Design a protein around this nucleic acid. Structure first.
Lengths: 91, 63, 112, 50, 77, 251
RNA sequence: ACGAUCAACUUAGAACUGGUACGGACAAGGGGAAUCUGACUGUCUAAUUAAAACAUAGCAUUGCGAUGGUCAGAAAGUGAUGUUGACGCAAUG
RNA sequence: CAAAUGAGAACUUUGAAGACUGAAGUGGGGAAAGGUUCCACGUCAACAGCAGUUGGACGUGGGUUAGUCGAUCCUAAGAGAUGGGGAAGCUCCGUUUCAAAGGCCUGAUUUUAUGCAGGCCACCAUCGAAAGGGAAUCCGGUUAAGAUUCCGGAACCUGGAUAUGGAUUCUUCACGGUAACGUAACUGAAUGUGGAGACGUCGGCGCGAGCCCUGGGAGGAGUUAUCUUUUCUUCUUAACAGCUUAUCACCCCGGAAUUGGUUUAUCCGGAGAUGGGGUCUUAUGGCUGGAAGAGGCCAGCACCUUUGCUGGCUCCGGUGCGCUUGUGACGGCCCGUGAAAAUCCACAGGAAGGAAUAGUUUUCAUGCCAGGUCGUACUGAUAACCGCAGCAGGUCUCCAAGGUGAACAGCCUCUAGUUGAUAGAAUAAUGUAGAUAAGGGAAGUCGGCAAAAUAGAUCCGUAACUUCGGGAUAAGGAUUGGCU
RNA sequence: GGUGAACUAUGCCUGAAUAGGGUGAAGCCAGAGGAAACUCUGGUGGAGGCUCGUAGCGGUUCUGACGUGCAAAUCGAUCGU
């Protein structure tokens, strides 16, 4: 059930551009074309429209996210620190 | 006359074929016909009651 | 096969220069110029295709009656039924919540 | 072009009117040395290029 | 360019006060293979539209042509 | 000689930005009265792609306080902002992602973006995708917030300068190789006419300081003085050092 | 456990047959072992050079936080980048 | 080849034959450009590198008909006044800028008006597309030459006035449906808001239009030494008006694991699937009207003469990975996500006004009037454009039959068009273009230059190396018709 | 001191054009082997600045024709895409 040993979605680039660059592109292309959970409706319906746009096809909600992921680690960390600062301020 | 002969089965041998098998008749078209026939048969059998929904579903996946 | 021609001086396959081939009572094939198809009006809230509203070009909407352009419900020809219902429920619910929060604030100020 | 402007069409009309040979009687007019129209034009020979 | 259904509609159309000309066209169509009948088309010409009433009964068509007023210009062809 | 490419780029004939498909200037809400005394609540209507811009833009609708009107502001979308979200802008706004609090009202260590360089300029700093500003400190006397910029520079800004909480969406964009002159072409086709880039060494001496020679070589030191003139400033302008450096952010 | 209209073009097989011919005209890859060189697709000396030259993605360096960098203008209450903001712009290899 | 015309014919006209273009045409039209080249009559001194009776030549004239096609209107990149600022200045910048920047609703409304103590607001001039955006027309006929422009018929839009019928009204501004929503109507200012305008590309799938193919039947033509219930050919239905017609979407009942439904493509369901029942968009098709009265195919009538008339028929189907076009629901791509404005409609709100022998409704039906200006002929190219020319060059686009075949190349043929390029005789060398060759097989040559060989499809088989994707059609073998 | 972007270079705006094949990427469905981990197979689908090759765009070689040319750059074959 696997037509390619290791190129995966980067089989479209054939033998061009170099194996390392194709490997990086493979990683980010799997992330960019993947389907994500919607935190609002709870279904795997969130797709990338353009770099940064992540639209849920079911609850019709657009989200601002990473270029190739709905959420980046930097965004999650920033959200954590902002929560910590907010609770320190409120209490 | 040649169309009647070709219906009868003449003038279609390896010397008369000049395009690939897929160029002549797409495997995708053949598969579409096959799958539509199978799905239509399964739906008709289920609506008639000859098979139940569960057997219909497993046969649908098999097809 | 009979071959047709543009009836206008525009020789290009632009979006406003679309033609169809039609048979005339004279028995010959002619080119009929077709106008751009009309897109269904959309809901202002959710953006879905509005139902019960006809699809015409914007000026074509001027010649039709009012019934063809709207629905008997509130926000009829503007917003869909589900969005109107959602905003009715929203309005009632959060105005009731406003009353509740006002009462709770007054009573906590009395307690204070 | 088929789709002309009125300025271009007016120039066309003026050119068509001017393109005609000498009336015969100017030749017989006295003290006359004009024998033909020396400003004659053909559409293939000289373009007025307006 | 507009059909008429009922004789009452035809009558209001013919008294509409802006129609003056009626054309009566005879079509020899077929209802069954062995029964070619006589179909009558009463065409009242209004200012904006051309109303046409189809009548498959010869008796009904005769009573129609007799009952329309003689002042209106009827043209049978 | 000849007028070189970097000299020609200032006349702005073919080198102006391609702005047809852009979605408007992304600016903060005008600092009127609510933004500096309380807060105002707007609603995120749509998050859209802006051509030539890696960050998404957010259209936010606010109520006009002085008239029965709706004002649509075009924001730089922060990561986590979604349609239907309520944005709060003002001095009294709370520390949440997407809000537009002033620097004086946010605490130390806050992540902010679309920060104003002066109070009222409607956003100048940390506007590219993935970029942010760190709040380092406050000086309440002659209120001045110290911040750290995306380049590592320490800046002192007024405490009344606005800024959106969070990081900018579209981050991690430059982690993907373009792989293709085609991808570079389509990138710059709606930014500006700056690609492809011919090397000066591959030109003639009429066309560039580097051009000419029987081999492709610069000839003189490629580090150019800051006091040089247009036509001379081609290479490494006012370079303090050169060569591959093993180093860190150092900030 | 099974019946009837409705002839649609694909595939495979078997004899038979002929001056062994049959993609019967047309249409239609020569192939292999290497060396030098440029990664590739792409571009240019219109009218003697299409290349190994240019470009390219990738890599690296440089300047600049806007009262700024780079560039324009005789000047300007003037401009390009810039509807821009370091994941950027500008300059190089 | 033969007639005709003519003083004169290889070249003009007509007839016959042979051919070609072969539907990304040598066909039918247009855009830029040209400018009368269009058409008729007369005519051949010059021009058509031979000729000429012919012509895009010469002479004389005729011809272009619009509310609906364009322009006109809008805005795009951009250009560009004003205010203001530079510059000795010609002028430069600037286009909402450090401006006191206007037009738009209803009353005032003939002691005076279009004044004003009525009211609303606050755009940045303007130009910029004959392929972008847009109000509305089709069929048949008609000329020597114009026609979506004329005529006949049948419609539509915009702007005006404007009465009648219908609807509503003592429950003042309608009712019905659980609902999606329906209907002939069914008040709606300021102000606000929302839609349409309004958008890439590719792929397969579905549907439709035309075309292609095909059966029966009703006419005409061809072939008929023999055969062929045969071959070719007509059997058409426009805009516009009503009824009907939909994938998608949505609503009601209901409450799902034994998970089911389901596409070619794997997505969808307790945020409510399956199932039953419905609502809407009208792409699109069907029926009727238009409309058989038209067009077309046939047969016959008064005997030179710019003359018509009368009879029939114009019908019923089928098929498909078919071609092309349009549409639909989808899927892929992007650090690329694929105009704006005029304009039109709608919604929120409720200003204002309104009864009864009559008010309102001109978003329901009917009825009345008008629609200006400029373009419109023709070519669009191996002769109408540019290249000094009637130049083997260059120059944007629409339609697109049969067979072979994978195939809009290659070959042949229908419709349509052309048969134009100075000719006659002969067949030396040397050439240009196309070929073949014994035996050898690169010995030729700077060098396999040039040519030859290979070649489609099916099956088998396929190495080193590799960035695991390729290499690869590697290499290397076999087969190929016709008939039953 | 003036005139040229009707050729051409580049950007922008608004339009238009591009048969038929080969290969067969992701996604998805079914099956087999295995104690398991997992591996393997058959389909489906239709990716690519992929490939053969029309129209198109270009211009490698013949150092072919021509070279007082059809032509102040064309013609034919062969070619690139």
């Amino acid at each position: 059930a696997k037509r390619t040993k290791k190129v995966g979605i980067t089989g479209k680039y054939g033998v061009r551009y170099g194996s390392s660059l194709r490997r990086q592109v493979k990683k980010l292309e799997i992330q960019q074309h993947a389907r994500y959970d919607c935190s609002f409706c709870g279904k795997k319906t969130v797709k990338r429209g353009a770099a940064g746009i992540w639209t849920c096809s079911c609850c019709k909600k657009t989200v601002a996210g990473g270029a190739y992921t709905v959420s980046t680690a930097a965004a999650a960390t920033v959200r954590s620190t902002i929560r910590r600062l907010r609770e320190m301020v409120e209490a | 006359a040649h169309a009647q002969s070709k219906r009868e089965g003449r003038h279609s041998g390896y010397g008369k074929r000049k395009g690939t098998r897929e160029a002549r008749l797409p495997s995708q078209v053949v598969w579409i016909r096959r799958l539509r026939v199978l799905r239509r048969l399964l739906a008709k059998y289920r609506d008639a009651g000859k098979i139940d929904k569960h057997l219909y579903h497993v046969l649908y996946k098999e097809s | 096969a009979q071959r047709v021609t543009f009836r206008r001086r525009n020789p290009y396959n632009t979006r406003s220069n679309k033609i169809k081939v039609v048979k005339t009572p004279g028995g010959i094939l002619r080119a009929q110029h077709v106008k751009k198809l009309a897109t269904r009006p959309k809901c202002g809230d959710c953006g879905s295709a509005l139902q019960g509203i006809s699809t015409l070009r914007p000026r074509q909407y001027a010649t039709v009656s009012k019934t063809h352009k709207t629905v008997s419900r509130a926000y009829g020809g503007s917003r869909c039924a589900n969005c109107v219902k959602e905003r009715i429920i929203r309005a009632f619910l959060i105005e009731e919540q406003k009353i509740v929060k006002k009462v709770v604030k007054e009573q906590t100020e009395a307690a204070k | 072009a088929a789709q002309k402007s009125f300025r271009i069409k007016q120039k066309m009309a003026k050119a068509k009117k001017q393109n005609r040979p000498l009336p015969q009687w100017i030749r017989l007019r006295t003290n006359n040395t004009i024998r033909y129209n020396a400003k004659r034009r053909n559409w293939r020979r000289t373009k007025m290029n307006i | 360019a507009r059909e008429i259904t009922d004789i009452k509609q035809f009558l209001e159309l013919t008294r509409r006060a802006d129609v003056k000309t009626a054309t009566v066209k005879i079509n020899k169509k077929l209802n069954k293979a062995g029964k070619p009948f006589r179909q009558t088309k009463f065409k009242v010409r209004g200012s904006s539209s051309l109303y046409t009433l189809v009548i498959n009964d010869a008796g009904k068509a005769k009573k129609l042509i007799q009952s329309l007023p003689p002042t209106l210009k009827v043209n049978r062809l | 000689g000849r007028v070189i490419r970097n000299q020609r780029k200032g006349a702005g004939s073919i080198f102006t930005s391609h702005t047809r498909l852009r979605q408007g200037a992304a600016k903060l809400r005008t600092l009127d009265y609510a933004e500096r005394h309380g807060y105002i609540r707007g609603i995120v209507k749509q998050i859209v792609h802006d051509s030539g811009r890696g960050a998404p833009l957010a259209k936010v609708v606010f109520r006009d306080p002085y008239k029965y009107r709706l004002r649509e502001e075009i924001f730089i979308a922060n990561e986590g902002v979604h349609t239907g979200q309520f944005i709060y802008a003002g001095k009294k706004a709370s520390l949440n992602v997407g809000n537009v609090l002033p620097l004086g009202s946010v605490p130390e260590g806050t992540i902010v973006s679309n920060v104003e360089e002066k109070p009222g300029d409607r956003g100048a700093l940390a506007r590219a995708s993935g970029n942010y500003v760190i709040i380092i400190g406050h000086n309440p006397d002659e209120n001045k917030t110290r911040v750290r910029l995306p380049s590592g520079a320490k800046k002192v800004i007024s405490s009344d300068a606005r800024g959106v909480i969070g990081v900018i969406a579209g981050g991690g964009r430059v982690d993907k190789p373009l792989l293709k002159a085609g991808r570079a072409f389509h990138k710059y086709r709606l930014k500006r006419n700056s690609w492809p880039k011919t090397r000066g060494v591959a030109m003639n001496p009429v066309d560039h300081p580097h051009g000419g020679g029987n081999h492709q070589h610069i000839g003189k030191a490629s580090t150019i003085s800051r006091g040089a003139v247009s036509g001379q400033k081609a290479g490494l302008i006012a370079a303090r050092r050169t060569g591959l450096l093993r180093g860190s952010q150092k900030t």
